[PDB]
């Protein structure tokens, strides 16, 4: 069981860090979340005014 | 274990520290009354599940501490830490140095002792203050001198509001500013400074904000301090320890007064349309507008420049934009510094305060300049003192409260030596 | 194995990021693992 | 073994070139991903003539596709056979000439031709015993004819011995698609007289004739017209890539053809051409393509050979055929008349028979005729060049980049001894 | 990556870009919110918008245009209209005090406070360019900002940038029906500061578009919104060859060397041939040859100038839609060999043909119809020297009695500047007459 767990986790981590479609995927996700937060906060400050 | 102990002295100190500690408490997941529903750089931990800051607050007018002691952060601090005097320093260097602070310097140093025995890997102190007032000059001078001769060669960083050219509230402000610069010329490792008039102009221009209060300035100073000390809490591509500034920036032991700014100060309604890449922000650091201390940049040449990048940043963008800045030959770097810069990078992006006005930006730079331009500010700050001290205005209170007439003179000469020292290291 | 890992990471992180995505996050019709609501969008 | 490097220049060149590589690749069994899917054993051995040898059994061409403007090669990255080119080979620029032969020869052409010429030696280094080059043009433009002349002389100085073919499309004289082109065709012919070892000229006006009257198309696109040139482009080189019972490569069809080394402007044609219905009714014998390779209607340049004599005449044939019957019908062509035929060269005929026809026809024929009746193609452009140049029309664009008034007159004097070098043999 | 910077100026420039940028948000799939919709945002195979629109990292497209005037009431209908959040708000420059229909007020007095400001927003927009194909000035020969400040932009763009294309679109004051009285003082004093610093400048009367609307579009009483759809269709058709690929692709840098025989004869006039009301498009075939024969008419021009009294120096025909180029070249041989259409005897070639694949689009509410193919002729005929024999006489009558000159000399101008820019059009009225003459 220990073998199972450790090997699985290590595989996942390193293989993700190494492939690539993932790099573009992450940049996209981060930017999207950031701009969503930005618009939400703009709306919030407008409501505050 | 990169622990630092923060002491806020002066009303400028505690009112900056309010914004600083709300920023640090929202930085981690700590809810503001103390609990939690990496943080050991600034917070000790008790087994009920409580977090205690490494902070000591002090003033000699009880109301500015007592509003903190009653307000929404009453359960953050061990309530003996909020030190409080009885009689105000009354804008008097002699009273905050010789007469009134002799009741409270012992208490604040003993609580500094207890916090430094709580700590285990100690690195430095953060003393927050101004150059305007009696307890912002004299009590800070006694505090720094005693901590220097007591603790050793540990980094007592100080943060200074600076007296602007045409912006002041006091009348006697050259007197106590030249006095605190004289007696704190030696035992502070570095002294960062900011100008309230320049922050006023940036608040008018970049942020599209008219009539700013003091909270809209202290938020910016909190972002500056957090960008200084993100390296100890969060790990990155090129970390920079807090001791590294001492061997990095200052070349001679009277020149430890670097300037700062922070480039993506931008509101949401414009940053929604504008992208801010690495080359954009590091070119934007070097405008005469977007600096944060009023000195004419083009009249001075640069000595060193420590950039701190925060967020998503790839190091080749930095290493290309630095040479792009260097080759212009109008940004005059001194001919005995071919290295030029010093750069650090951290991964975790700048954060956002509730009730805020700076837009959430993915990456940000805080740059620490060391210019030759501030000789004009020292010339004018010697000149105003010289205008008043031609016929002994306002001196008789301070001489009735504890210095003779000659000590203002020897502080005048021991400050003019520094203005000669810039022309020495300039030519 | 790298394509299977890419599917695992997409179906873990990209579930709630519905209203917007950047350009290169989806290629050759990966929606079938998140079938439930991405199709009707 | 004997290999060919291919060069494609200008917007007309890439449109010609993308249609040309299809009629080589489908001949050689190559699919759009570049993996061999052919059937016959003889199909594959001479794949080294044009193609390289990629890994895993993949074949890539040896063309370099120079263009000033990137807006034409984005079409051929999405073409039907537009994938097999190596992406290093695509060379493109930022500022287009815009039909100014001065700008396509001096201003940005000098900046770009390094990037082409490093790729030029790279596809020449992989050769074993290189045999020559190949180029595609249309003379009316500043981007292809302008770049092409600087792309010919810079390759002559490094590989001066090799048989360097260069195609050309001379401009249509009845209605031109450009108004500035008499400066452009006349400035390019002077560079095309001196340096190229072999050239062909193509009146695209006669291509509008050859689809209307004979082929009976209704909607002739330029892409379907570039099929007609692509038969002749593969038609001449068919002995370098295939067997032969009477063969003639490029070198045996130039030095067997050209009497004097300023006379290499030829007039080609293709004999078995019919509409889809009309293919059924008309025979496929040996004289019935001799009826049509010399037929003045079925020519490719608009210079009728009843305005002079034929110096030397060629016809490469494809397919297995008898050689009495190709000789007696070539004996008859010279002997039915002596007016259109030269006295002082006793024969005229060049004959070549390969063994594999193009797929779709049992027989094929590609015509090369070196006529004296091409001189009116130059006295037509001589009068159109001197109509503009008397009042100096449009000349203020060509001057401002480094061209003077003398550079037209020497390119007109050399252009005007070419008719007399034709008129002396013609009479 | 190719690009244009569509810089407007004047109150008759903002009202043109209101109808110009609504066309370019319809050619692409762009919403007025700026974000692309759901269907085109997953594949992303199209990068044709990079000529005009930028692209931020969060997926919003912001156009490349700056709107300039000194009258704060026509920009303030853009910050509340449908296109409120498309344009970046730092690109709508707007002055408090007016220009008030004086050239000298808009060159020396007021415009110096904005000549520095707009040249910082220009430097942003031109800084993203890998390659700049050319600017697009939209101005007017009528009043203060559209004629004065345009001359101040020309003497500062070319000093800043230099050998870079800068096309120009301009109305021309009508023969008879104009709307000002100080107006011929401007149109003689804005040609003189444009004879040197503009590579090409198209000519349009608003009077000839008032004639085509009662005639071809079958519309009675046309408003000003229906004049900026016709001009907005041409500036689409000029720049369509950058964005969408074609069989004969003709860029902006192609034009400026291919239309001007001598370097102060850069005033070509243009037309758009297939303008048909949607009733008559149901009745009329619109081939490729018969909309080439309908540019050279005495009625489908755009400057009130009949070119029967002049010789055509050159043409530059740009086609758009579904055309095949056997059938283009059949028709240009008809027009050269026809007797009336005069060609100058030092141009035996004559023409310039361009082909593109996109059919013209339809704006909702536009009076134009969906026509399969459309052309756009560009020529600089000899006949335009007639029109200066009308405007330069109207400068002379007013300057003989020195009418209206006292506002100009008091608003930062010297009185001699009318004299030197009067003698300057005493050359250009002759400079057309020396090159229209047959060869000696």
Look up the CATH number of the domain holding residue D59. 3.40.50.1440
Measured CA to CA, the distance from residue B176 to residue B169 in angstroms comes to 13
Rounded Cα distance, B351 and B365, in Å: 13
Task: Pick the closest to residue D266 from D295, D305, D240 (CA basis).
Answer: D305
- Pick from E38, E44, E59: which is nearest to C41 by CB? E38
CA torsion, points B289, B293, B297, B302, in degrees to nearest 10?
-130
Unique residue bearing structure tokens 């080294």? D48
Domain end residue (candidates: D257, D273, D292): D257
Nearest-by-CA chain A residue for B357:
A45
Q: Are B297 and B288 in contact (CB under 8 A)?
A: yes
State which approach was used to obtain the coordinates.
cryo-EM
Neighbours of E264 (CB within 10 A): 12
Instruction: For residue D113, count other CB atoms closer than 10 A to its CB.
Output: 18
| Residues written for chain D | 427
Please state whether beta strands D364-371 and D265-270 pair in parallel, antiparallel, or not at all (unpaired): antiparallel
The answer to whether B95 and B172 have CB atoms below 8 angstroms apart is no
DSSP state of D376: H
Please choose, from the candidates D274, D49, D8, the residue with its C-alpha nearest in 3D space to the C-alpha of residue D148. D8
Same domain, D207 and D354: no
E421: Cβ–Cβ under 8 A, 6 or more apart, which residues?
A: E188, E189, E192
Calculate the alpha carbon distances from D269 to D134, D266, D299, D426, E335 in Å.
18, 10, 5, 22, 32
Encoded tokens for D183: 């400066």
Look at residue D327 and give its three-state secondary structure.
coil
Q: State how far the Cα of E43 lies from the Cα of C27, in Å rounded to an integer.
A: 8
- Sign of the C-alpha dihedral computed for residues D8, D13, D16 and D18 taken in this order: positive
Q: B72 in helix, strand or coil?
A: coil
What's the rounded Cα separation, in Å, for the pair D254 and D368?
Answer: 11
Contacts of E276 (CB under 8 A, 6+ apart): E216, E217, E284, E286, E368, E369, E371
CA distance E57 to chain A (A): 7
Question: D343 CB contacts (<8 Å, ≥6 apart)?
Answer: none
Enumerate residues preceding breaks in chain D (C to N > 2.5 Å).
Answer: none
Residue B406, C-beta contacts closer than 8 angstroms, at least 6 positions apart: none
Parallel, antiparallel, or unpaired: how do β-strands E317-321 and E373-381 relate? antiparallel
What single-letter DSSP state applies at residue D306? Answer: T
Nearest-CA neighbor of E179 among E248, E259, E263, E101? E101
Kindly give the residue spans of alpha helices, DSSP state H, lying in D157-199.
181-194
Residues D335 and D406 in one domain: no
Residue B112 is inside which H or E element, if any?
helix B105-118
User: How near does any CA of chain B get to the CA of E90, in Å?
Assistant: 8
CB neighbours of D403 closer than 8 A, spacing ≥ 6?
Answer: D102, D106
Best interface-test mutation with A: which of B268, B353, B355, B364 has the largest number of A CBs within 10 A? Answer: B268
Question: For the domain that residue D390 is a member of, what is the CATH number?
Answer: 1.10.287.600
- The answer to whether B89 touches B100, Cβ cutoff 8 Å, is yes
From B158, B219, B160, B223, select the one nearest B195 (Cα to Cα): B160
Contacts of C21 in chain E (CB under 8 A): 41-42
Residues D28 and D128 in one domain: yes
In degrees rounded to 5, what are phi and psi of residue D177?
A: -85, 0
E-strand spans in D236-309?
244-246, 265-270
**How many alpha carbons fall within 13 Å on the CB side of residue B278?**
19
Q: Do B362 and A41 touch (CB under 8 A)?
A: no
C-alpha gyration radius of chain A: 19
**Cβ neighbours, 10 Å, residue B207:** 18
| D215 and D231 assigned to the same domain | yes
Helix (H, G, I), strand (E, B) or coil at C22: coil
Kindly tell me whether chain B and chain A come into contact, counting contact as 3+ Cβ pairs under 8 Å.
Answer: yes
Residues D310 and D288 in one domain: yes
Q: What is the dihedral of CA E300, E302, E303, E307, to 10 degrees?
A: -30
Same domain, D189 and D248: yes
3-state secondary structure chain B: CCCEEEEEECHHHHHHHHHHHHHHHHHCCCCCCCCCCCCCCCEEEECCCEEEECEEEEECCHHHHHHHHHCCCCCCCCCCCEEECCCCCCCCHHHHHHHCHHHCHHHHHHHHHHHHHHCCCCCEEEEEECCCCCCCCHHHHHHHHHHHHHHCCCEEEEEEEECCCCCCCCCCHHHHHHHHHHHCCCCCCCEEEEEHHHHHHHHHHCCCCCCCCCHHHHHHHHHHHHHHCCCCCCCCCECCCCCHHHHHCCCCCCCCCCEEEECCCCCHHHHCCCCCCHHHHHHHCCCCCCCCCCCCHHHCCEEEEEEEEEECCCHHHHHHHHHHHHCCCCCCECCCCCCCEEEEEECCCCCCCCCCCCCCCCEEEEEEEEECCCHHHHHHHHHHHHHHCCCCCCHHHHHHCCCCHHHHHHHHHHHHHHHHHHHHHHC
Closest listed residue to residue E309, CA positions, set E208, E184, E433? E433
**Buried (b) or exposed (e) across B169-202, using 16+ Cβ within 10 A?**
eeebbbbbbbbbbbbbbeebbbbbbbbbbbbbbb
Cβ–Cβ gap E89/B270 under 8 Å = yes
Only one residue has tokens 């004739």, namely D209
Contacts of E163 in chain D (CB under 8 A): none
With contact defined as beta carbons under 8 Å apart, do B113 and B94 qualify?
no
DSSP E strands, B191-247: 191-195
Report helix angle B173-183 to B405-426, nearest 10: 70
Q: Contact, E409 vs E415, CB < 8 A?
A: yes
Tokens standing for residue B361 = 């930006």
CA proximity to E11, closest of E87, E69, E94: E69
C-alpha distances out from residue B347 to A14, B245, D399, Å: 19, 20, 57
DSSP D399: H
Cα–Cα separations (whole angstroms), residue B19 to B2, B4, B218, B221: 22, 18, 6, 8
Contacting subunits of D (3+ beta carbon pairs below 8 A): E
D153 is annotated as contributing to ligand binding: no
First vs last C-alpha separation in chain D = 44
Query: Of the candidates D331, D349, D374, which is a domain's last residue?
Result: D374
Contact D21, D61 (CB under 8 A): yes
Strands in E204-205's sheet, in edge-to-edge order, are E2-5, E131-140, E166-172, E204-205
What are chain B's partners, defined as 3 or more CB pairs within 8 angstroms? A, E
The conformation of residue D312, written as its DSSP 8-state character, comes to E
Helices (H) and strands (E) in chain B, counts: 15, 12
Taking the CA atoms of chain E, what radius of gyration do you get in angstroms?
A: 22
Angle at D191 between CA D190 and CA D197, to 5 degrees: 110
Q: Within 13 A of B169's CA, how many CA atoms are on the CB side? A: 9
From D243, D135, D286, D92, select the one nearest E131 (Cα to Cα). Answer: D92
Write down all domains in chain B, each with its CATH number in brackets. 2-258 (3.40.50.1440), 259-373 (3.30.1330.20), 374-427 (1.10.287.600)
Q: Judge if D64 and D205 occupy the same domain.
A: yes
CA D403, D406, D411 angle in degrees (round to 5)? 95
Residue with tokens 């444009």: E194
The resolution, in angstroms to one decimal, equals 7.7
Other residues' Cβ atoms within 10 Å of the Cβ of residue E295: 20
Helix (H, G, I), strand (E, B) or coil at D91: strand
Look up tokens 């061209």; give the residue: D403
Distance CA E274, CA D314 (A): 51
Q: How far apart are the first and last CA of chain C?
A: 30
Rg (CA), chain C: 10
Pairing of strands B363-371, E373-381: unpaired
**∠ CA D270-D275-D279, rounded to 5°:** 85
Closest-CA residue of chain E to D74: E245
Distance, CA of E378 to CA of E260 (rounded, Å): 11
The residue from E27, E155, E254, E411 that is catalytic is E254
Please report, in angstroms and rounded to a whole number, the separation of the first and last CA atoms in chain E.
Answer: 48
> What DSSP assignment string belongs to B308-370?
EEEES--HHHHHHHHHHHHTTSSS-B-TT-SS-EEEEEESSPP---TT--S---SEEEEEEEE
Query: Same domain, yes or no, for D238 and D306?
Result: no
Tell whether E41 is within 8 A of chain C (Cβ). yes
Instruction: Answer yes or no: do D51 and D15 share one domain.
Output: yes
**Residue in the structure block whose two tokens are 């942020």:** B207
B162 marked among binding-site residues: no
Q: Can you give the residue range of the structural domain that contains D388?
A: 375-425
Reference D300, options D327, D276, D273, D275; nearest CA is D273
D138 assigned to a ligand binding site: yes
Spatial CB neighbours of E346, under 8 Å, sequence gap ≥ 6: D387, D388, D390, D391, D393, E439
Q: How far is CA E146 from CA E30, E111, E163, E170, in A?
A: 30, 11, 24, 9
CATH number of the domain residue D342 falls in: 3.30.1330.20
Do D400 and D360 reside in the same domain of the chain?
no
Final residue before a domain boundary, out of D333, D356, D374: D374
Does D291 share its domain with D357? Answer: yes
* Inter-chain touch C22–E59, beta carbons under 8 Å: yes
Say which residue the tokens 């219905």 belong to: D277
Cα separation of E335 and E328, whole Å? 12
Same domain, D292 and D241: no
Alpha-carbon separation of residue E59 from D143, E128, E381 (angstroms): 37, 17, 47
To 10 degrees, the CA torsion angle through E96, E101, E105, E106? 70
Question: Any idea which residue has 């993949």 for tokens?
Answer: D58
Helix (H, G, I), strand (E, B) or coil at D294: coil
Q: Per DSSP, what are the bridge partners of residue D350?
A: D314
Domains: count for chain D = 3
- The candidate with the shortest Cα–Cα distance to E317, out of E287, E273, E352, E344, is E352
Which residues in chain E (46-105) have CB-CB distances under 8 A to chain B? 56-58, 60, 62, 88-90
- Whether chains B and E touch (3+ CB pairs under 8 A) is answered by yes
CB B215 within 8 A of CB B19: yes
Burial class from Cβ neighbours inside 10 Å (0-12, 13-18, 19+) for residue E220 reads: exposed
- Cβ of A38 and B272 within 8 Å? yes
Strand partners, B305: B341, B369
């Amino acid at each position: 069981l220990k073998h199972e767990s450790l090997k699985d986790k290590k595989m996942r981590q390193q293989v993700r860090e190494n492939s690539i479609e993932l790099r573009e995927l992450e940049q996209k996700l981060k930017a999207a979340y950031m701009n969503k937060e930005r618009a939400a906060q703009i709306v919030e400050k407008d409501a505050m005014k | 274990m990169r622990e630092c102990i923060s002491i806020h002295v002066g009303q400028a100190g505690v009112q900056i520290g309010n914004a600083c500690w709300e920023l640090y408490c929202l930085e981690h997941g700590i809810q503001p009354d103390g609990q939690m529903p990496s943080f050991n750089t600034f917070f000790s931990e008790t087994g009920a599940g409580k977090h205690v800051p490494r902070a000591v607050f002090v003033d000699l007018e009880p109301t500015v501490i007592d509003e903190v002691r009653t307000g929404t952060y009453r359960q953050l601090f061990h309530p003996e830490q909020l030190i409080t005097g009885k009689e105000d320093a009354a804008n008097n260097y002699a009273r905050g140095h010789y007469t009134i602070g002799k009741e409270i310097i012992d208490l604040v140093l003993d609580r500094i002792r207890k916090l430094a025995d709580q700590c285990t890997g100690l690195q430095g102190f953060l003393v927050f203050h101004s150059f305007g007032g009696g307890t912002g000059s004299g009590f800070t001078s006694l505090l720094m001198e005693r901590l220097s001769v007591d603790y050793g060669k540990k980094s007592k960083l100080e943060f200074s509001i600076y007296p602007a050219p045409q912006v002041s509230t006091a009348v006697v402000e050259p007197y106590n500013s030249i006095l605190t610069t004289h007696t704190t010329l030696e035992h502070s490792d570095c002294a960062f400074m900011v100008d309230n008039e320049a922050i006023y102009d940036i608040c008018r221009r970049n942020l599209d904000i008219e009539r700013p209060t003091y909270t809209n300035l202290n938020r910016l100073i909190g972002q500056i301090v957090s960008s200084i000390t993100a390296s100890l809490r969060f790990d990155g591509a090129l970390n920079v320890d807090l001791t590294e500034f001492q061997t990095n920036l200052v070349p001679y032991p009277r020149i430890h007064f670097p300037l700062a700014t922070y480039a993506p100060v931008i509101s949401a309604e414009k940053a929604y349309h504008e992208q801010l890449s690495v080359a954009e922000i590091t070119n934007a650091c070097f405008e005469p507008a977007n600096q944060m201390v009023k000195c004419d940049p083009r009249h001075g040449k640069y000595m060193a420049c420590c950039l701190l990048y925060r967020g998503d940043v790839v190091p080749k963008d930095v290493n290309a934009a630095i040479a792009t800045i260097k080759t212009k030959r109008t940004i005059q770097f001194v001919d005995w510094c071919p290295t030029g810069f010093k750069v650090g990078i951290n991964y975790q992006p700048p954060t956002v305060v509730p009730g805020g006005d700076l837009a959430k930006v993915q990456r940000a730079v805080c740059m620490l300049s060391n210019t030759t331009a501030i000789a004009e500010a020292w010339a004018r700050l010697d000149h105003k003192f010289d205008l008043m001290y031609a016929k002994r205005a306002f001196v008789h209170w301070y001489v009735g409260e504890g210095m003779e007439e000659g000590e203002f003179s020897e502080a005048r000469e021991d400050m003019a030596a520094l203005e000669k020292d810039y022309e020495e290291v300039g030519v | 194995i790298i394509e299977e890992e890419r599917l695992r990471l997409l179906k873990e992180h990209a579930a709630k990021l519905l209203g917007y995505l950047p350009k290169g996050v989806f290629k050759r019709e990966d929606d079938v693992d998140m079938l439930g609501e991405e199709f009707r969008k | 073994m004997r290999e060919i490097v291919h060069l494609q220049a200008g917007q007309c060149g890439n449109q010609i070139g993308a249609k040309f590589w299809e009629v080589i690749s489908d001949e050689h069994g190559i699919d759009p991903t570049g993996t061999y899917h052919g059937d016959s054993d003889l199909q594959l051995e001479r794949i080294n003539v044009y193609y390289n040898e990629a890994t895993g059994g993949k074949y890539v061409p040896r063309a370099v596709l120079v263009d000033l403007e990137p807006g034409t090669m984005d079409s051929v990255r999405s073409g039907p056979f537009g994938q097999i080119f190596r992406p290093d080979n695509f060379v493109f620029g930022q500022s287009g000439a815009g039909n100014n032969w001065a700008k396509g020869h001096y201003t940005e052409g000098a900046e770009l031709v390094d990037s082409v010429l490093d790729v030029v030696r790279k596809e020449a280094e992989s050769c074993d015993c290189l045999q020559g080059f190949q180029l595609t043009h249309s003379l009316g433009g500043g981007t292809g004819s302008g770049m092409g002349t600087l792309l010919i002389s810079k390759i002559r100085e490094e590989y001066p011995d090799r048989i360097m073919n260069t195609f050309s499309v001379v401009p249509s004289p009845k209605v031109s698609d450009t108004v500035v082109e008499p400066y452009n065709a006349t400035l390019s012919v002077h560079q095309l007289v001196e340096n190229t070892d072999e050239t062909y000229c193509i009146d695209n006006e006669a291509l509008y004739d050859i689809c209307f009257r004979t082929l009976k198309l209704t909607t002739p696109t330029y892409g379907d017209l570039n099929h007609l040139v692509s038969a002749t482009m593969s038609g001449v080189t068919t002995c370098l890539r295939f067997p032969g019972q009477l063969n003639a490569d490029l070198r045996k069809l130039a030095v067997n053809m050209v009497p004097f080394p300023r006379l290499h402007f030829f007039m080609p044609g293709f004999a078995p051409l019919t509409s889809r219905g009309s293919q059924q009714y008309r025979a496929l014998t040996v004289p019935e393509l001799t009826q049509q390779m010399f037929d003045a209607k079925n020519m490719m340049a608009a210079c009728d050979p009843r305005h002079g004599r034929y110096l030397t005449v060629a016809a490469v044939f494809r397919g297995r055929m008898s050689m009495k019957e190709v000789d007696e019908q070539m004996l008859n062509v010279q002997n039915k008349n002596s007016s259109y035929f030269v006295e002082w060269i006793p024969n005229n005929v060049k004959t070549a028979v390969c063994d594999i026809p193009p797929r779709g026809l049992k027989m094929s024929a590609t015509f090369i005729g070196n006529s004296t009746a091409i001189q009116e193609l130059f006295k037509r452009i001589s009068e159109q060049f001197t109509a503009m140049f008397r009042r100096k029309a449009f000349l203020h664009w060509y001057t401002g980049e480094g061209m003077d008034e003398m550079e037209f007159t020497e390119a007109e004097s050399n252009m005007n001894d070419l008719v007399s070098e034709y008129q002396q043999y013609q009479d």
